[PDB]
């Protein structure tokens, strides 16, 4: 097991909001043992890669300079609600 | 285009020798604009990930310490010939 990490296990759902993906991706990263340098690259490469086939298209149109705030916010309405109904 | 690099475009063939994958992966990396820190992580994570469904199994049995020399050499015989016939 060279280093299967766990971030690679993150993937925005087809109809899931990016904000959730970022929150989860950051949640995982915070639990990922790696150099910050990786975060800048990984959080900039695999962040939009494992994204849903929807967020990748829109997020791209934003520009390779868009910030997380811009990505999450601009991705608003892209996916369905993340909190609703839910079973006890 | 955040940064789709090109390394992600590398993937050992189902019956291709790892030595070729490493040579190609290193060939691409040498043409990849990234921090060395990424090489240590990427060349250790995505190196075995994009590998063929064959090399990954064997290479794993070697141990997360197996050096490149150990990976390429030990992967000898796993895949078929890398140079033969070829059309002019």
CB burial of B61-87 (b: ≥16 within 10 Å; e: otherwise) equals eeeeebeeeebbebbeebbeeeeeeee
State the residue range of the domain holding A80: 1-88
> Hey, is the C-beta of A1 within 8 angstroms of any chain B C-beta?
yes
The method of structure determination was: NMR
Count of domains observed in chain A:
1
Distance between B49 CA and the closest CA of chain A, angstroms:
8
Distance of alpha carbon A21 from alpha carbon A10, whole angstroms: 8
CA A72 to chain CA centroid, Å, is 9
CATH number of the domain enclosing A26: 1.10.1200.30
Judged by phi (left if over 0) then psi (alpha if -120 to 50, else beta), residue B17 lies in beta
Binary contact (A3, B64; C-beta < 8 A): yes
Q: Do the beta carbons of residue A38 and residue B37 sit within 8 Å?
A: yes
């Amino acid at each position: 097991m060279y280093s299967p990490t766990s971030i690679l296990d993150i993937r925005q759902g087809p109809k899931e909001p990016f904000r959730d993906y970022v929150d989860r991706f950051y949640k995982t990263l915070r639990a990922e043992q790696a150099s910050q340098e990786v975060k800048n690259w990984m959080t900039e490469t695999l962040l939009v890669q494992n994204a849903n086939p929807d967020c990748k298209t829109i997020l791209k149109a934003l520009g390779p300079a868009a910030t997380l705030e811009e990505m999450m916010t601009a991705c608003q309405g892209v996916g369905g609600p993340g909190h609703k109904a839910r079973v006890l």
